[PDB]
Design a protein around this ligand. Structure first.
Ligand SMILES: *[C]C1=C([C])[C]=C2C(=[C]1)N([C][C]([O])[C]([O])[C]([O])[C]OP([O])(=O)OP([O])(=O)O[C][C]1O[C](N3[C]=NC4=C3N=[C]N=C4[N])[C]([O])[C]1[O])C1=NC(=O)[N]C(=O)C1=N2/[C]=[C]/[C]N([C])[C]([C])[C]C1=[C][C]=[C][C]=[C]1
Ligand SMILES: *[C]C1=C([C])[C]=C2C(=[C]1)N([C][C]([O])[C]([O])[C]([O])[C]OP([O])(=O)OP([O])(=O)O[C][C]1O[C](N3[C]=NC4=C3N=[C]N=C4[N])[C]([O])[C]1[O])C1=NC(=O)[N]C(=O)C1=N2/[C]=[C]/[C]N([C])[C]([C])[C]C1=[C][C]=[C][C]=[C]1
Lengths: 499, 494
């Protein structure tokens, strides 16, 4: 029954919020809909894999909050293998390379590629992390999809192909599905194109030893019987002195305040009294989550390394089930594995097959790209399709279709009376990651503390010291990168030097 | 507790379904979330207005199922006034006209306008009503907004402004919010641009004497205590022999089958065991409804008719709270009124004001468009903002953003084990309307009858005889309309 704060949701965000409020001497209850905590992170354990993350996994420099939290819970990171060459597979052929960027040799394609990445970043500088609807060209950019934007900017098919893959991999959605404003904000608040795409010095640098599910698992240990499992919340009543929150198994909770720490759309699954205000009522019908299946194929040895390949594959094409892969072997070097993501429309299309049919298709693909018959000989396979989760709605995260971010965006983390909103979607730095879950959980926890007069307004938003274990190298550009023209800028320069 | 069929939803679709099944001798329960039936229709009654529809209202030719159902229930239609001239208000000035379509005088603007409506309709001829995702260029058209489309087709700002108003008014949504495929399907299934936009011979021809809320009210009369009010459904369990359906006030219902007769997205409000399959699980988080406030201003007399105006105004521009109006006076000639819609971003924007602030804005606009100080002097005002409704999600209906109709659209009326899907959004002819509600309610009712062996497969989808009271005149084009070039076609000819 009665407590200080009810947290709806036992994913990283809700658990971080509860822990903070608990740590502050308040009585919290976490109500988790599933028979586990973790939400979009999930470590499966078994003899064949030891452990493996089937959802949220990677951490990297600038992700200082998740790293501080995990370290406090006794967890360690190891670095994702990137010692040997990466592979860009283009028109049925593999081009090994080194560096975070695939080489381009043809100087036109080179200028177009430079300009595109450059422009993503230029455009994002104009977008406030905390209020994207405030950018000078907010409406113009929100009225376009990423598809219209890519069409306008890429004067080569090669750059349009790679840029399309980048969007697919980043937000698990098609270019034509998502707002250009929101996708530009998304990349910008992760610290930019380079930080987001990179393994070394980027978001995929590292993974927790033992899996990321331990973050939520271990907080639940600390909270004990304050975490209630298999309590899906169905009803919130704020008409009375204390807030009433009812679960599906008929239990009633009573708090001073509530943190909603679930995806914004999953708010639909709760009936509200009084009804939500108008803009929230409509916002939650407008914010879908992407589509992905995460796939891990196991082998006897990491045989790719022998050919001087780290196991990272960037795979152009419609034919390819998977556009990107990473070595998923353990830091000890056993349980050799390749991780791959089936994204967006391919998630929807290949869901129709059986587990055995998907495995075969990956192996056959990976045998082509890597040039290795050994890829046809896996020992184990695990996969999770996040599209089927009633209590996620999809993965990695929530995306905004055109016209929504500017009409409805400010509503996302606006309190409704005594409810406050956490969840990775309400973060202003690495929103959509395990990092933004933390930021938002802890932030919404401090908003409630402020409401009670325990802390000043000053202290609701709070900066994080940099990890001494995972420090960030700065993102640098060369002079040529900054000043090489685009294609149309070269064409205009050819136009001028003549007349 | 126990019955043959539980219907989730007390709107026209659910009530039509329940009444069919009831009429067939099955035991039906209708579970209604609100303290009323009707859903997106609502007739408020009072001394000042007598009656007024604050939601769904208009009926016209080719809407033969709503008309058959309401006739059986004892309801009558009257014709929406369109005796005098219409007004197109362009760049701050009112141009009166007769006939469906507002006149275009510039030769080039004429050719561009012609080509645009013509092309809407050409395009839609390639879209199956029951399977839009099957159009030969399904993906191409679904991967574009209406906005990219309009920007490609309209070589004149004038045609692009009117076209934009057209989308706004049709689907309560911005051009950039909606799929091109879905919008072209939408228009196609209402029988084309002319049928949809028209008052005489179109969908705004008629309203019900006494309000359309009587359709749902009177079916609930017939069903009596089978209709359960303030029973929001929260939970559906299909793991056991009979289907279990739980309401928010803790009551449990058990049935052989279930009809879900609610907007597709509002299925989010229900927790399912087993979980929904994957494509439905994700579909219902992708399908929003538009934004509108329906506003009705009352006056002593229908003064516009003295100036030879029917009350229909087409209003270009951003400054305008309302793009379109209709005479809302009663067939008797009293309770003079003008009805307008505040649509899409303007609904979102003007919601922030008070009721009195919105009134003043409408009165001042209408005084301008009509050229009448009498507009500034109303006796009463009523309005409804459908954005605020927890159990509609908006109005008029559900729209598809780009990429959704081709990836998810087949899932809409696919049964999930013993649940069947009704509600206007699943209709194939006038989906969006009071008409599609009936078609889909009766159809999903027939699917369950088939499931039980009471009727053959043959009889699930059923054609409707034409109203003898409201017959349709055919939609005609002239030779010039069909063969006049477009702007680029004339340029290529030059
Ligand atoms: C799915 C996924 C995957 C597959 C992958 C990934 C991911 C995912 N991600 C994401 C994460 O994980 C997230 O963010 C998080 O986790 C979130 O959290 P939160 O906010 O807290 O949320 P959640 O989890 O969901 O929770 C919630 C909870 O609640 C509940 N509920 C519901 N409802 C309800 C409830 N309760 C009660 N009641 C009611 N009513 C549920 O159950 C839960 O529990 C990620 N992240 C990170 O960080 N990392 C990673 O790694 C990840 N992943 C991924 C990614 C990838 N990427 C980025 C890419 C590949 C990269 C690149 C890009 C570009 C180029 C190249 C590369
Ligand atoms: C809102 C509105 C307005 C304002 C207007 C309009 C409309 C609307 N519309 C629509 C109609 O009405 C519809 O469609 C119908 O109604 C539908 O129905 P249904 O399907 O059945 O659905 P609903 O109603 O929603 O119901 C459902 C029910 O359910 C319930 N729930 C929920 N959830 C739940 C429940 N329960 C239990 N549980 C749970 N969970 C609810 O509550 C309900 O009751 C329309 N329509 C027609 O037909 N007509 C008309 O008039 C209308 N309106 C309008 C329109 C306009 N337009 C079209 C325009 C203006 C024309 C034009 C165009 C272009 C150019 C020119 C002109």
């Amino acid at each position: 029954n009665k407590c200080d704060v009810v947290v709806v949701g036992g994913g990283i965000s809700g658990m971080a919020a509860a822990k903070l409020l608990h740590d502050s001497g308040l009585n919290v209850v976490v109500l988790e809909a599933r028979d586990r905590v973790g939400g979009r992170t999930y470590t499966l354990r078994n003899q064949k894999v030891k452990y493996v993350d089937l959802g949220g996994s990677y951490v990297g420099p600038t992700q200082n909050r998740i790293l501080r939290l995990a370290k406090e819970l006794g967890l360690e990171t190891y670095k994702v293998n990137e010692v040997e060459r990466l592979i860009h597979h283009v028109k049925g052929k593999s081009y090994p390379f080194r560096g975070p960027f695939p080489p381009v040799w043809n100087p036109i394609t080179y200028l177009d590629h430079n300009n595109f990445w450059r422009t993503m970043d230029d455009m994002g500088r104009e977008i406030p992390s905390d209020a994207p609807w405030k950018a000078p060209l907010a409406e113009e950019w929100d009225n376009m999809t990423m598809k219209e934007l890519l069409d306008k900017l890429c004067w080569t098919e090669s750059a349009k192909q790679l840029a399309t893959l980048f969007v697919n991999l980043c937000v698990t959605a098609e270019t034509h599905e998502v707002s250009a404003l929101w996708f530009l904000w998304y990349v910008k608040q992760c610290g930019g194109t380079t930080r987001i795409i990179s393994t070394t010095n980027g978001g995929q640098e590292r993974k927790f030893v033992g899996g990321s599910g331990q973050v939520s698992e271990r907080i639940m240990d600390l909270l004990g019987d304050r975490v209630k499992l298999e309590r899906p919340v169905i009803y919130i009543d704020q008409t009375r002195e204390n807030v009433l929150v009812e679960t599906l198994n008929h239990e009633m909770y009573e708090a001073k305040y509530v943190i909603s720490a679930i995806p914004p759309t999953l708010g639909m699954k709760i009936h509200f009294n009084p009804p939500l205000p108008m803009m929230r009522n409509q916002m939650i019908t407008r914010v879908p989550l992407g589509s992905v299946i995460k796939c891990i194929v196991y082998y006897k040895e990491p045989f790719w390394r022998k050919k001087d390949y780290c196991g990272t594959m960037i795979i152009d094409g419609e034919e390819a089930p998977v556009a990107y892969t990473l070595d998923d072997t353990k830091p000890e070097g056993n349980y050799a594995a390749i991780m791959g993501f089936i994204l967006a429309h391919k998630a929807r299309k290949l869901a129709r097959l059986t587990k055995e049919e998907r495995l075969k298709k990956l192996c056959e693909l990976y045998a082509k790209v890597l040039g290795s018959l050994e890829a046809l000989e896996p020992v184990h396979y695990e996969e999770k399709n996040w599209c089927e989760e009633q209590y996620s709605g999809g993965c990695y995260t929530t995306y905004f279709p055109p016209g929504i971010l500017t009409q409805y965006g400010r509503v996302l983390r606006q309190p409704v009376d005594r409810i406050y909103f956490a969840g990775t979607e309400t973060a202003t730095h690495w929103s959509g990651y395990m990092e933004g879950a933390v930021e938002a959980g802890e932030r919404a926890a401090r908003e409630i503390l402020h409401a009670m007069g325990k802390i000043p307004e000053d202290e609701i938003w709070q900066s994080e010291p940099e990890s001494v274990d995972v420090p960030a190298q700065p993102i640098t550009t060369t002079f040529l990168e900054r000043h090489l023209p685009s294609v149309p800028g070269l064409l205009r320069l050819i136009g001028l030097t003549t007349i």
